[PDB]
Amino acid sequence: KLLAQEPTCPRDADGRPRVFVEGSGAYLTDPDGRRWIDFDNARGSVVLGHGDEEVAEAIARAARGRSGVGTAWSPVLDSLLGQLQEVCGGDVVGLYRTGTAALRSVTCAVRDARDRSIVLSSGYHGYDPMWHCDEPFTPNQHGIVEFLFDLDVLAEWLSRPEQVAAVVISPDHMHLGERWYTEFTRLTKEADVPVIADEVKVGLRYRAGLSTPLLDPAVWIVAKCLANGSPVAAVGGDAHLLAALEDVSFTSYFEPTAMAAATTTLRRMATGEPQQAIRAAGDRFIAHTRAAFANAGVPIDLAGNGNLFQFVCADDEVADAFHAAAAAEGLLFFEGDNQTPSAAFTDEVVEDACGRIDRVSAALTGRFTDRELTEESWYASAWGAMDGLADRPRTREETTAIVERLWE
């Protein structure tokens, strides 16, 4: 009631935050003792599992100053910077506490280095007001043009390339395919405009590297997969585009628990093994759930893969009913957005989650059988999870109509 902010978190049907007392692996316990399976995982930043013991031991030693203190440089920092450069590439690297701060700092630096006013953007880049706009496809008061992953609009803006400082995108892989990325990179290379890959969510999510070799980013940002939820974001790329980062310093720069969590987590994510385990387990859950709904006439499908997926519901009434039924079974989904299992989502948890889905499907069967997913269902669902337009065939006038329906 005192809070001036509106943090994203699980909320009940009345909008009140759901409180959880404790967590271990994939399971959360609520104040009433009920155990829930977490698919939200701090918005995808818990990738190893809640309370992971190896990370916890490193955090605990760091909380006692055993490898360094917040006052000063220590060998842990050298190790972390080297790990980031090895896995993501680039001339130089930088560190931040949030993805929002990293994206603002990098975008300002690139704009300054390029001495150009316009930035073309798709995807969410954090809460800073520099990204706010009243309308898509036109510059906001900060010179940023939201293009909603529409390549026709992008090509239009890139046809006059001399004023375009950069193109910044948060890559989606549920609704954008290989053809989208090949054309995106062709267009940006043709205009000679640097690409900023905002991989806060997808960097290290699917493999031990950035999300797609079909992008050639001049600058990257990663964060959620770096530190099992501890507040660390990293950036890197071409030195001349990041020169202004020399002006960046913050009080908690050397704080040791954050670096302990990042070095320990990154070492495991750099092997690719957690992402392979998550992919297999999540794929099993997706296949079971898709069939459970399809075999009961429930108009809900899924997009994505085991590492990152989402539910696609026929309409908002179906989605609301699904979310209520899922919560009643103790499934904790990121409602209307993407689901991101952690490595603690093992076969035993998959089996538990599938039984809960069987009960969700039972609760919904017979309520919505005469409804079907339409193109509108797909666009609306994708919009909520990846913050722009799915890559489905349409004309320039149809783009305007879809945006008119979905833009708030």
Ligand X SMILES: CN[C@@H]1[C@@H](O)[C@@H](O[C@@H]2[C@@H](O)[C@H](O[C@H]3O[C@H](CNCc4c(COP(=O)(O)O)cnc(C)c4O)[C@@H](O)[C@H](O)[C@H]3N)[C@@H](N)C[C@H]2N)OC[C@]1(C)O
Binding site residue list for pyridoxal 5'-phosphate: 99-100, 251
Please calculate the CA angle 230-231-236 and round it to the nearest 5 degrees. Answer: 115
Among 116, 143, 185, 253, binds a second copy (CB under 8 A): 253
H or E element, residue 122: strand 118-122
- What does the alpha-carbon distance between residue 337 and residue 39 come to, in Å, rounded to a whole number? 11
How many whole angstroms separate alpha carbon 339 and alpha carbon 341?
6
From a second copy, ligand X, none, interface partner of 67 (C-beta below 5 to 8 A by class): a second copy
Q: Which long-range contacts (CB under 8 A, 24 or more apart) does 133-136 make?
A: 135/407, 136/403, 136/407
Nearest approach, Cβ of residue 334 and ligand X (Å): 7
- 126 belongs to the binding site for ligand X (CB under 6 A): yes
**Quick one: which of 23, 25, 90, 99 contacts ligand X (CB under 6 A)?**
99
Q: Smaller CB distance to ligand X: residue 215 or 364?
A: 215
CB 145 within 8 A of CB 119: yes
Site string for ligand X, 364-393 (x = CB under 6 A): ---------------------x-x------
Are the beta carbons of 401 and 372 closer than 8 angstroms?
no
CA–CA gap between residue 173 and residue 93 (Å, rounded): 25
237 near ligand X (CB under 6 A): no
Distance of CA 382 to the CA centre of its chain: 13
Integer Cα distance of 104 and 124 in angstroms = 12
What tokens were used for 149? Answer: 């992953």
For position 115 contacting a second copy by CB under 8 A, the verdict is: no
Least distance from ligand X to the Cβ atom of residue 102, Å: 8
Establish if 103 lies at the interface with ligand X (CB under 6 A). yes
Q: Which of 236, 299, 304, 330 binds a second copy (CB under 8 A)?
A: 236
- Helix ranges (H only) for 89-196 are 99-114, 151-158, 178-191
Q: Report the DSSP beta bridge partners of residue 223.
A: none
SS3 letters across 282-340: HHHHHHHHHHHHHCCCCCEEEEEECCEEEEEECCHHHHHHHHHHHHHCCEECCCCCCEC
Give dist(CA 154, CA 273) in Å, integer. Answer: 36
92 binds a second copy (CB under 8 A): yes
Rounded to whole angstroms, how far apart are CA atoms 52 and 228?
8
- Which of 121, 257, 263, 361 touches a second copy by CB under 8 A? 257
| Binders in 152-181 for ligand X, by CB under 6 A | 170
**Residue selected from 71, 213, 395, 404 as contacting a second copy according to rule CB under 8 A:** 71
- Choose among a second copy, ligand X, none what residue 70 binds, the Cβ cut-off being 5 to 8 Å by kind: a second copy
| Only segment of 69-77, 143-151, 190-198, 353-361 that touches a second copy (CB under 8 A) | 69-77
Choose the stretch contacting ligand X; rule: CB under 6 A; options: 23-31, 55-63, 121-129, 172-180: 121-129
Q: With binding defined as CB under 6 A, does residue 331 bind ligand X? A: no
CB of 308 to ligand X, least distance (A): 9
Contact pattern for a second copy over residues 305 through 344, marking x by CB under 8 A:
---------------------------x------------
Q: Does residue 198 interact with ligand X by CB under 6 A?
A: yes
- Residue 107 within binding range of ligand X, rule CB under 6 A: no
Q: Which does 385 bind (CB under 5 to 8 A by kind): a second copy, ligand X, none?
A: ligand X
Distances from the Cα of 346 to the Cα of 204, 224, 300, 317, angstroms: 19, 20, 24, 32
- Choose which of 138, 159, 160, 239 interacts with a second copy (CB under 8 A): 239
**Binding letters toward a second copy, positions 43-62, x by CB under 8 A:** xxxx---xx-x-xx--xx--
Contact residues toward ligand X (CB under 6 A) are: 8, 43-44, 98-100, 103, 123-126, 170, 198, 200-201, 223, 249-252, 337-338, 385, 387, 408
